[PDB]
Amino acid sequence: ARAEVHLRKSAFDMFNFLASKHRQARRATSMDLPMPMRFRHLKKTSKEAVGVYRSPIHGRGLFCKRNIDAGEMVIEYAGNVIRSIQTDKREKYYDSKGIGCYMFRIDDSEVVDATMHGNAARFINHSCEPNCYSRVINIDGQKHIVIFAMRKIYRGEELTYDYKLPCNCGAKKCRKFLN
Amino acid sequence: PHRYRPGTVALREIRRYQKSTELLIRKLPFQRLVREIAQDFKTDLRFQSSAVMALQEASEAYLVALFEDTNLCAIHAKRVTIMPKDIQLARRIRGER
Amino acid sequence: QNYPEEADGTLDCISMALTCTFNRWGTLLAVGCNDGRIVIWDFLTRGIAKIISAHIHPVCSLCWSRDGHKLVSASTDNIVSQWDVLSGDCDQRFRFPSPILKVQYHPRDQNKVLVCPMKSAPVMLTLSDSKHVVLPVDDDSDLNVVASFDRRGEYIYTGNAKGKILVLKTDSQDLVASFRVTTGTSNTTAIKSIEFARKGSCFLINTADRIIRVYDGREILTCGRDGEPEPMQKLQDLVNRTPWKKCCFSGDGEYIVAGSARQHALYIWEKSIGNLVKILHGTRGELLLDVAWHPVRPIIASISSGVVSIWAQNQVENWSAFAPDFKELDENVEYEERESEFEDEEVDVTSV
Amino acid sequence: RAKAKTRSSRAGLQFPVGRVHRLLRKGNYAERVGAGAPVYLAAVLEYLTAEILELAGNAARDNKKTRIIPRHLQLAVRNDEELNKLLGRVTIAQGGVLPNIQSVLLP
Amino acid sequence: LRDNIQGITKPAIRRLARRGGVKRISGLIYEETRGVLKVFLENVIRDAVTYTEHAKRKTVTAMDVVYALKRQGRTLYGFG
Amino acid sequence: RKTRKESYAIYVYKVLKQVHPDTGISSKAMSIMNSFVNDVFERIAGEASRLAHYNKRSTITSREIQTAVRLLLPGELAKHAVSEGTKAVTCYTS
């Protein structure tokens, strides 16, 4: 109160999304249709499917708002389609900036960047007993990265997958070395 | 001291209500229900009396037929007590949901 | 953006609203009520600004002055008072024939007010003293005349219950231009209201055969006396046949809104092409009273059974106002950034 | 004696208005048929036709095809909610079904 | 108004179930039955009010109810 | 030389080339679309005829067609069909 000059004045963070509230078949993505029939309806569903909140595990995490069923699509990981040597400049650059690595490679050629450009598939934490996984699919020649599911997921439960250093996952099947 | 074994008064009420022909719902609460759920379509409507009597006849007949088909589902599952999943099975085989 | 689409709440604060108007900048909203109360809201803050008790009998007409500091009304009690927004005191009051339709200031001067009585002729007044000039009426047989100033203030258009529009000069009463509206084949129709735009010369005539005609303010000055112009645009509804109640223009005089007297809807047309662009429905069994339009922003204020609704664009937000260095894309975008991979200006700060 | 302009062009439609007006006059519906009724009805029929052909063309694109066969009409109708309620008691020939296996049947 | 779906009490559903021929009833049937009845009544009331608005009236007569039910696929003798 | 058969093939083909400019259609799908247009025509026309008989009129106007569309189509689909019909009549008059 105007005199007690204290610490905790700087945090060096890009997102101030950590809020006070943090309130954490029929559909085409769940049907047995071919792949571009599901991929078209994906982006219309993913706006109301999930959201990002304050994760107790590590920073922020992805929290659903509706019962994801088993084996369906959830969200697409999409950002800058960069190549695998600008990743080295950006790793050293955000080593100098202190910002972590957001680099999924589609194959052994190109990498998707999710630092300057992307969507809400950044905020998915790591775990050891997950409930999601990924594949690489083919929609009209181009390739995409889809986060599927593994079982029926209840409203409020956090979504995690294996990324493939001490971690805050805390699962019983932990490895404690993530490389 | 005297009490009937449970089931006896149920069977004789079945016979008593299948013998008569009357309305089995009170009619001032049903009239209030009709006016309330008609209020969300047009403000200040003005019903007759035979309109409300026709709606009550039709609603009673619909619910009695639904309970007959529900009872057949519950007997098919080798039970006696009717549960709401029997109602769901009846309304989905029939073509309503 | 443009013309509104979504319902966007209400103002259920004071019951029994009856009429409404905006000022030149669209920051205030004066509404008369059923017991002589004039409640002013705000749209900059979305709150009630000032409540002034006017009379005991209801208010059916309101008009803002040019500076915005003076109101005027015409209640059932034949009372026309130049009110105050600061003090709120009645100054002038004198009786008329008992029905009164409309009052309106001069669009450049807050000295001249144009009162339209029901069973009389138009009377142009002054406010420096108690003068009154009864304007001439051609027919003098029905005595059902509506009139209004034009945009700048140079002329006054008058209309009768026989479809004969006259043009009088605003100060010397010069009957210089006139026409009779070509209604169907032979029969003539009434005139209900005359309204003017905010930018340009166009205006609209609300007749009684349920057709709205959009004219041009210069073709009348070209044709002169007893000419025969034809409308630029004829707007109507033929499915429900829709007898209209109130009309006005958009912000820059581009779109036209027209409320209905039967079904509580709002129809919006274009002026240039002339096609129907949107119908805005609402509560199914109400009755419509007044339609407004915000002069620089798409807001419509419809009074119906004392409830004022505001159709206001449904603002839906995003990221990148929080994190300006990030671009929230939708699908993948491939590129590389660059083809080479690695003054004394004194400006017045207190100028208004 | 002027240039003939069909009533479809005057309203901005693609379905015919003269044929709909004839089929209302020669169909034993009423004695007298108004002026705006075939214009209204041709507008409604064009809207429903475009609404179903949009979804059928999308399914035909997703199956790596160019043309439209009855399977794509089947998928388009049965996936939408309100087209399914409209065409509920209707069998489309050469159409098939939707993939649906119950939960308690797979291990 | 928030009530009047509660006004369909719970000896009345019992009497309808016994005219249907039912011996033993659970305790969730009550809310399930109230939902069923509200859906049916909404679908009939909507078409009756449509016929009334087209006729340019303000009262719902018995014939509008009969015509609505006849559209549903449920004929009703005795009120025409 | 055969006897002529009126259909709706060319008009469905016009609507398809508005909405998807590089897509064709086979014969059986065109037959299904022809049957669909005839079915919906007969439903709406029969309901409008029955309304005009209930109210003791001799005329099918556009208001009976509007009420028949509102009775017969479900929800938002009726909400958009009413708009399309009203817009076409408004463009036809002027």
Ligand SMILES: Nc1ncnc2c1ncn2[C@@H]1O[C@H](CSCC[C@H](N)C(=O)O)[C@@H](O)[C@H]1O
């Ligand atoms: N479960 C977990 N426990 C500890 N660290 C984790 C973790 N999940 C992810 N991380 C680390 O956090 C980074 C992911 S971004 C973490 C969420 C978000 N950026 C936020 O904190 O607001 C990665 O570099 C990873 O090393």
Ligand SMILES: [Zn+2]
């Ligand atoms: Zn860990």
